[PDB]
Design an enzyme around this catalytic site. Structure first.
Site, PDB file in Angstrom:
ATOM      1  N   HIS A 119      -7.883  -5.593   2.640  1.00 55.06           N
ATOM      2  CA  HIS A 119      -6.978  -4.446   3.000  1.00 55.06           C
ATOM      3  C   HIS A 119      -7.024  -3.409   1.885  1.00 55.06           C
ATOM      4  CE1 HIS A 119      -5.208  -6.858   6.203  1.00 55.06           C
ATOM      5  NE2 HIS A 119      -4.940  -7.809   5.323  1.00 55.06           N
ATOM      6  N   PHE A 120      -6.817  -2.155   2.257  1.00 59.04           N
ATOM      7  CA  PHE A 120      -6.778  -1.064   1.275  1.00 59.04           C
ATOM      8  C   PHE A 120      -5.306  -0.760   1.024  1.00 59.04           C
ATOM      9  CE2 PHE A 120      -6.902   3.226  -0.414  1.00 59.04           C
ATOM     10  CZ  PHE A 120      -8.096   3.233  -1.149  1.00 59.04           C
ATOM     11  N   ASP A 121      -4.846  -0.868  -0.227  1.00 58.58           N
ATOM     12  CA  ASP A 121      -3.401  -0.704  -0.511  1.00 58.58           C
ATOM     13  C   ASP A 121      -2.994   0.721  -0.932  1.00 58.58           C
ATOM     14  OD1 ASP A 121      -1.000  -2.424  -0.258  1.00 58.58           O
ATOM     15  OD2 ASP A 121      -0.704  -2.123  -2.425  1.00 58.58           O
TER      16      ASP A 121
END
EC number: 4.6.1.18
Length: 124
Positions: A119-121
């Site tokens: 996931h890209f935070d």
């Protein structure tokens, strides 16, 4: 089903260009990666670096994720990114985006064996 690692590559990786191609970039890419199928996804980031360099982030600086989990990592170096943000005129199914190019540190969540981005935070 599509694996979590594969989903991250589809939603966030674009190694073919070094920076935001043109004013049209987000419109084209949000559609072609299937991010406008069920709704207009309101915000998304693409990273213009090699897959190997992004996977290496899972061994860099450990930081807290926005959701409170502790499996997030921040890149030591800056990376070339493009932010896509939904415009005011945008109405499904005709989704419309503004394209912004920046050089920032990325924060990603990692899981699995092998340990890879899922996931890209955030970018900082």
């Amino acid at each position: 089903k599509e694996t979590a690692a594969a989903k991250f590559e589809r939603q966030h990786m674009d190694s073919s260009t070094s920076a935001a191609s043109s004013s049209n970039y987000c419109n084209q890419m949000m559609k072609s990666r299937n991010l406008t199928k069920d709704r207009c996804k309101p915000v998304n980031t693409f990273v213009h670096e090699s897959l190997a360099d992004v996977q290496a982030v899972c061994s860099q600086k450990n930081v807290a994720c926005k959701n409170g989990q502790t499996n997030c990592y921040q890149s030591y170096s800056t990376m070339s990114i493009t932010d896509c943000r939904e415009t005011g005129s945008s109405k499904y199914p005709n989704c419309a985006y503004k394209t912004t190019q920046a050089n920032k540190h990325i924060i990603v969540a990692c899981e699995g064996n092998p340990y890879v981005p899922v996931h890209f935070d955030a970018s900082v």
